DNA sequence: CTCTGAATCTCTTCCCGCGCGCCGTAGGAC
DNA sequence: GTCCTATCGATCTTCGGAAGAGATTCAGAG
């Protein structure tokens, strides 16, 4: 095999919309408000600190724009994969277990004991492995090795459209602007263009 | 007709034996 | 004319919760008793009824005080052993005693059951156009039936049983085949049922190392249990449980051969978090790996290899 | 139609299909069915590797048979090799274990 | 009946409510509005029972 | 004052969407609501971005999306798309100076 | 004020083989 | 005519699937 270095982080889509999220019930965050994040809609904020604002809460770039002056920088909000990729590192993850597990019977209710009952059981899982939560997120993307992928010649001097082949064409295009336009460090809104074209690709 | 033989891989006899007439199916006092 | 007692869905509380009734009286206040009861001749009417028999009728032994009005082929199996529930399930009764209304119906109604003895607080909220079987008076059991209608596995699983089960389904699904004339063994079935619940629920974790409730396989509890109980500590409690096959298989301990069959990027993702580890017993996963099923000949050849040992 | 042998797919090494090519008739999903319902388990790991998959196998039965040693060596199919690179393609870190 | 789910006030609230389920992301706009709304019923390129 | 604002084009026919532009501002005369257009070029960035120097009235923005071969504007939202920054307008310049 | 009921949305599944037949990146700029 | 780069960043992907199940959204109220 190789690998593809991504310019940025990203989220793997399996784990973003299986049958619940993965990561939206590791975070308790609804998958459409992760998805708001992912793809560049909203704000999400961390680390809050001395500030009017909570352990994740997306905030639209109306209300950021209020933080941003309401506020200095006693807070942190980001957008993106490396925002959500910030909430997984963030994870306290068994302390976040013993309280929850514990939290559990803090009230009688179906409509949640058993919800919560999956969320106890993730994250003891994701303890129990050795896995970490960041990993949900991509930063190195493998490629297949190409034999599987054969770009074969047909009926002439043509390539069998061998569609892998054009959708890695699109990743490798987009992360080569990507890296441009970082390292000739374009504003926001462009780079918020690249990167969602970069996580849609 | 003899007791079956430890090792006889049942559940796939079984399967079969319910889905084989499932083409057979359709889809749409009188004595003292 | 014979009257018409009022609906529910006619009339108020003011009708509702005056839940009419025909109790049989004499001047002694209470009835010629059956040896052993304290319970009077109070009787009572429900919707629809139409009654002849008012105030001051001379009632016999036998009469009738009033009157109540009033399926597929291959698919009444396939939703049969998927253990789909029907869209009519016929509500049947729980734990045992005696049956009572509890509030009358606005929304719906709700009706109750309680024992002999224990937890008389037990009620349920109940459709209004199914026909009840009973009133308010009426022993009752666990599976007693309080409308017609078809039955449903996972209540009758929780009512009369694995065996119940086992004999529903069997004849339940042999019903078609013999009326289309096909001969099946019944054991063949039992087979398929014997996996449809091979999962089971924990209510008491007692001493084991489950969760304090937990799904788990029932083979998994139960190995635990035997040993547990020769410590003498205090073996898991659980119910069985019913999964139709379509479910029961992407529930099996084994990654491999669920994602194999369907719901691959589910499989194949809930197996990834949780950083499973497949051992490759059973027969598909041998297959996909191409080394000999541990099933007729290759069974034998396993057993050696695990004989010798 | 009859095919003893000759080509083979190039992602993954199974025969060809036709007879616009010369190709092997599928042994598919419900055969295997079928053998598992009988014991035969030795037909089935052949059916499924030596005579299909395993780029090694075939060519060292190939010249058992022409020995005429009837005997087989059965490795582990390179179209299995294909899905586990297929997923480890994907971020999913599958692999092979010992014990 | 529907007067009592409409949550409508009158036409432009309606055309809110038509242009922001139609095309959610885009903004509803007077001018902009019946740019959808004519070319769903009332217009030849887009509209046609021959 | 007038402050700058980024428009997505169709990546190739930039500088057939900039002559549009400047087009549609000339005919639907709203001259007092438009600065200028900027596509610079090194011996090509942006790769398809053209730079407008612009108010927002709904009407103007109505326009430039109503140019051909014109995605929309690149922001926070669609409602009140989003205006860059200062520095990053001088950086531009200086690039584009040098 | 949100707790168990129910309500609208999306996702996922749909026989096995087999044989033919054809058809198979575009648009713009230099 | 050949070589290189990109897709409606100024529309409109089809209504004639059912189902069947889940995730996710809302009632009448204690």
């Given at each position: ?32 408000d992760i998805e708001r994040v992912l793809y560049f809609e909203s704000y999400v904020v ?11 809460q997306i905030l639209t770039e109306e209300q950021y ?12 909000a980001?957008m993106?994969?490396?925002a ?118 | ?32 | ?309 | ?99 | ?50 | ?75 926070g939202t ?21």
């Open positions: 095999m190789g690998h593809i270095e991504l310019a940025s982080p990203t989220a793997h889509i399996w784990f973003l919309k299986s049958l619940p999220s993965r990561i939206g019930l590791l975070l308790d965050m609804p998958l459409r961390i680390e809050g600190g001395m500030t009017n604002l909570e352990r994740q724009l209020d933080a941003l002056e309401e506020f200095g920088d006693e807070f942190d980001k993106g994969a490396e959500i990729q910030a909430l997984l590192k963030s994870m306290d993850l068994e302390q976040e277990c013993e309280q929850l597990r514990e939290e559990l019977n803090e009230t009688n209710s179906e409509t949640k004991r058993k919800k919560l009952t999956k969320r106890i059981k993730l994250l003891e899982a994701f303890v129990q492995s050795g896995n970490k939560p960041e990993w949900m997120i991509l930063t190195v993307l493998p490629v297949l090795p190409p034999d599987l992928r054969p770009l074969v010649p047909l009926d002439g001097g043509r390539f069998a459209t061998s569609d892998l082949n054009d959708l890695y064409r699109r990743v490798i295009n987009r992360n080569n602007r990507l890296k441009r336009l970082l390292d000739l460090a374009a504003p926001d809104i462009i780079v918020r263009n690249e990167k969602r074209m970069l996580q849609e690709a | 007709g003899h007791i079956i033989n430890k090792g006889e891989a049942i559940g796939v006899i079984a399967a079969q034996s319910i889905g084989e007439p499932g083409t057979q199916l359709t889809m749409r006092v009188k004595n003292k | 004319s014979s009257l018409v007692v009022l609906d529910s869905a006619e009339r108020t509380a003011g009708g509702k919760d005056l839940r009419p009734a025909l109790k049989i009286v004499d001047a002694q206040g209470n009835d010629v008793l059956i040896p052993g009861t304290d319970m009077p001749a109070q009787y009572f009417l429900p919707g629809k009824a139409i009654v002849q028999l008012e105030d001051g009728v001379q009632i016999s032994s036998g009469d009738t005080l009033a009157r109540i009005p009033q399926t597929g082929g291959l698919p009444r199996v396939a939703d049969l052993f998927e253990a789909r529930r029907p869209k009519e399930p016929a509500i049947l009764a729980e734990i045992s005693g005696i049956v009572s209304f509890g509030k009358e119906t606005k929304g719906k109604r709700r009706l109750v059951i309680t024992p002999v003895d224990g937890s008389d607080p037990y009620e349920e909220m109940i459709p209004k156009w199914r026909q009840l079987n009973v009133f308010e008076g009426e022993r009752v059991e666990r599976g007693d039936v309080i409308s017609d209608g078809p039955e449903a596995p996972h209540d009758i699983l929780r009512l009369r049983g694995v065996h119940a089960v086992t004999r529903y389904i069997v004849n339940e699904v042999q019903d078609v085949y013999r009326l289309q004339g096909v001969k099946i063994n019944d054991k063949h079935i039992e087979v398929i049922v014997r996996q449809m619940l091979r999962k089971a629920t924990i209510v008491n974790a007692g001493s084991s190392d489950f969760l304090e409730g937990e799904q788990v396989e029932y083979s998994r509890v139960k190995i635990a249990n035997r040993e547990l109980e020769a410590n003498g500590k205090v073996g898991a409690t659980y119910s069985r449980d019913l999964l139709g096959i379509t479910k029961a298989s992407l529930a099996t301990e084994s990654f491999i051969s669920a994602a194999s069959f369907q719901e691959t990027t589910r499989v194949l993702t809930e197996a990834a978090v949780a950083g499973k580890r497949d051992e490759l017993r059973g027969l598909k996963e041998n297959v996909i790996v191409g080394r000999l099923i541990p099933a007729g000949t290759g069974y034998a050849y396993h057993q050696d290899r695990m004989r010798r040992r | 139609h009859a095919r003893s042998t000759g080509s083979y797919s190039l992602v993954t090494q199974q025969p060809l299909g036709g007879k616009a090519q010369f190709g092997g008739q599928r042994f598919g999903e419900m055969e295997v069915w079928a053998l598992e319902a009988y014991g035969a388990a030795y037909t089935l790991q052949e059916m499924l590797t030596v005579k299909s998959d395993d780029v090694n196998g075939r060519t060292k039965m190939y010249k058992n048979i022409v020995d005429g040693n009837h005997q087989m060596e059965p490795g582990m199919p390179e179209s299995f090799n294909v899905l586990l690179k297929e997923i480890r393609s994907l971020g999913i870190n599958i692999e092979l274990e010992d014990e | 009946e529907t007067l009592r789910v409409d949550p409508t006030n009158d036409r432009l609230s309606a055309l809110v409510e038509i242009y922001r389920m139609m095309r959610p992301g885009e903004p509803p706009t007077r001018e902009a509005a019946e740019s959808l709304f004519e070319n769903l019923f009332f217009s030849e390129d887009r509209y046609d029972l021959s | 004052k007038k402050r700058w604002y980024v428009v997505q084009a169709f990546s190739g026919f930039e500088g057939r969407v900039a002559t549009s532009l400047r087009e549609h501002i000339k005919l639907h005369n709203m001259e007092d609501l438009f600065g200028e257009v900027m596509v610079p070029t090194e011996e090509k960035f942006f790769p398809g971005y053209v730079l407008v120097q612009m108010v927002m009235n709904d009407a103007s923005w109505h326009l430039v999306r109503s140019v051909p071969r014109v995605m929309g504007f690149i922001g669609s409602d009140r798309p989003a205006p860059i920054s200062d520095k990053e307008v001088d950086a531009i310049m200086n690039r584009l100076q040098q």
